[PDB]
Design a protein around this ligand. Structure first.
Ligand SMILES: [Mg+2]
Length: 506
């Protein structure tokens, strides 16, 4: 206890991780982890139980001075007057609320075009959402879940006394709050959040630090009538949005953390997983990370708010008081799976093939919108091979086109983010795709820069610990922790590859 410890909690869809860490160095001291049930909806009771089991495995938190929770984004947790969870949390990957996301767009776009606005009501609705709160509705977003509940479960929507996100709710439970008996104080107002998670609700505007309670009323109207919906949306407790390095007004309950340290365990604001990982990776303004799993996520840190009027790039906030333009791609590594099926080869086979080719694949371009794309915003799109010729239509060139297509899409994302006014001056490559020799080899060439490969690690848990250490220290800058790098990929830029891709995708 002479040594100052913090704890970074990572409550993700799949599990809870607890990383007890050295406040000064970021060094791992203890670790623990527990599983969540599968499903795109879930009883938060399982998140509490997983946290408890994870923390116990990590040797408890009695010696911990500050704690932060990084959480899966968007998940809707609704509480009644008594602090009870009303119905299952609906998560980022629930698609139940898809109709509501569509309807929200039509509803905001309905009013006639104003000076400069698109004539198409859909394009116009998308643009109005982006300007209002940073992002155009998709099923992931919290507001769409609340909408769905109003439409499908009116008795439940009318009981809502508070709405919060997974990291918010876990933090509140850690502070020792929870369900109370009738006529007891639930302390719902003790709820707090940060800018990064709140920016994922589409009822919060980070630029102005304002909850848009009118957008909540808008979805409650279906169950309650207009004025009643207005009254409800005003009455609902929403978490206090804390600054990036503010301690919460409440500390951890001593039975949970800090009983053996001076001042107990303070609570840092916490945050959404993408932004927390970025903090953990030590990312600052100008950095982008590409997380390449079967699908992709390109997230850059932006000094100023970012507005993709198209509704492809999300306008989230990061965990340093700044901005997190976030570009999801449906097609990441899965493109390479397509390649294997198409050519009847395995991974190495595909790579050997592709390297046998040349940059540009002798003219063949793949626009890999298998099953559409999130970025650019083209839901009903399909993938397209172009530039084919008798001479060039071969397994080698096709192989190379599959790889170049994967990378070109990610570049396309970087260019779109740049177009929103956010400079990108360094690239980090993480996720499973990062171990792919072909992706790893061709990335610098087609992305157009060095590609840094941070060592695989618990970036969310590390980011949460870094934020708790930041708050605990009271200093203006976050803890300068050592970052481990696996390697840096360098390669001469080949602009013609992406230039051909851009033509093809249109
Ligand atoms: Mg509060």
């Amino acid at each position: 206890s002479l040594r100052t410890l913090v704890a970074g909690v990572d409550t993700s869809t799949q599990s809870c991780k607890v990383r007890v860490t050295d406040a000064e160095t970021g060094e791992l001291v203890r670790f623990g982890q527990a599983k969540h049930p599968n499903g795109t909806s879930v009883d938060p009771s399982y998140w509490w139980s997983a946290f408890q089991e994870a923390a116990e495995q990590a040797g408890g938190l009695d010696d911990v001075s500050a704690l932060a929770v990084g959480g899966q984004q968007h998940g809707m947790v609704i509480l009644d007057n008594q602090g009870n969870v009303i119905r299952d949390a609906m998560l980022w990957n629930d698609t139940s609320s898809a109709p509501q996301a569509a309807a929200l767009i039509e509803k905001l776009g309905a009013a006639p075009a104003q000076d400069g606005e698109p004539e198409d009501p859909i394009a116009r609705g998308k643009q109005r959402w982006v300007k209002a709160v940073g992002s155009s509705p998709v099923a992931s977003y919290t507001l769409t879940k609340v909408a769905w509940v109003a439409e499908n479960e009116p008795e439940n929507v009318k009981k809502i006394a508070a709405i919060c996100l997974p990291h918010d709710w876990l933090s509140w439970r850690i502070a020792g709050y929870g369900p109370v008996a009738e006529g007891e104080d639930a302390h719902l107002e003790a709820l707090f959040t940060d800018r990064s998670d709140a920016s994922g609700t589409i009822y919060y505007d980070a630029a102005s630090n304002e909850y848009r309670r009118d957008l909540i009323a808008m979805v409650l109207e279906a169950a309650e009538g207009a004025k009643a919906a207005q009254s409800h949306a005003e009455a609902i407790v929403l978490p206090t949005v804390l600054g990036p390095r503010d301690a919460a007004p409440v500390k951890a309950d001593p039975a949970i953390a800090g009983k053996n340290v001076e001042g107990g365990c303070l609570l840092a604001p916490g945050g959404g997983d993408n932004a927390m990982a970025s903090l953990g990776l030590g990312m600052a303004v100008g950095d982008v990370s590409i997380s390449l799993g079967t699908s992709g996520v390109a997230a850059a840190i932006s000094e100023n708010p970012t507005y993709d009027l198209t509704g492809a790039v999300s306008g989230f906030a990061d965990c340093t008081g700044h901005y997190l333009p976030l570009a999801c791609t449906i097609n990441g590594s899965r493109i390479l799976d397509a390649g294997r099926a198409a050519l009847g080869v395995d991974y190495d086979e595909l790579a050997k093939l592709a390297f046998a080719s040349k940059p540009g694949a002798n003219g063949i371009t793949l626009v890999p919108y298998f099953d559409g794309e999130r970025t650019p915003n083209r839901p009903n799109a399909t993938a397209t091979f172009s530039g084919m010729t008798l001479a060039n239509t071969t397994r080698e060139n096709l192989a190379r086109a599959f790889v170049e297509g994967l990378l070109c899409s990610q570049r396309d994302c970087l260019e779109l983010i740049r177009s929103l006014g956010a400079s990108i001056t360094r690239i980090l490559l993480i996720g499973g795709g990062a171990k792919s020799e072909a992706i790893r080899t061709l990335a610098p060439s087609i992305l157009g820069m060095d590609v840094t490969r941070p060592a695989t690690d618990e970036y969310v848990a590390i980011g949460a610990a870094r934020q708790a250490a930041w708050v605990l220290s009271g200093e203006t800058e976050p803890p300068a922790w050592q970052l481990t790098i696996d390697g840096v990929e360098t390669g001469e830029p080949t602009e013609a590859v992406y230039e051909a891709y851009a033509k093809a995708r249109g």
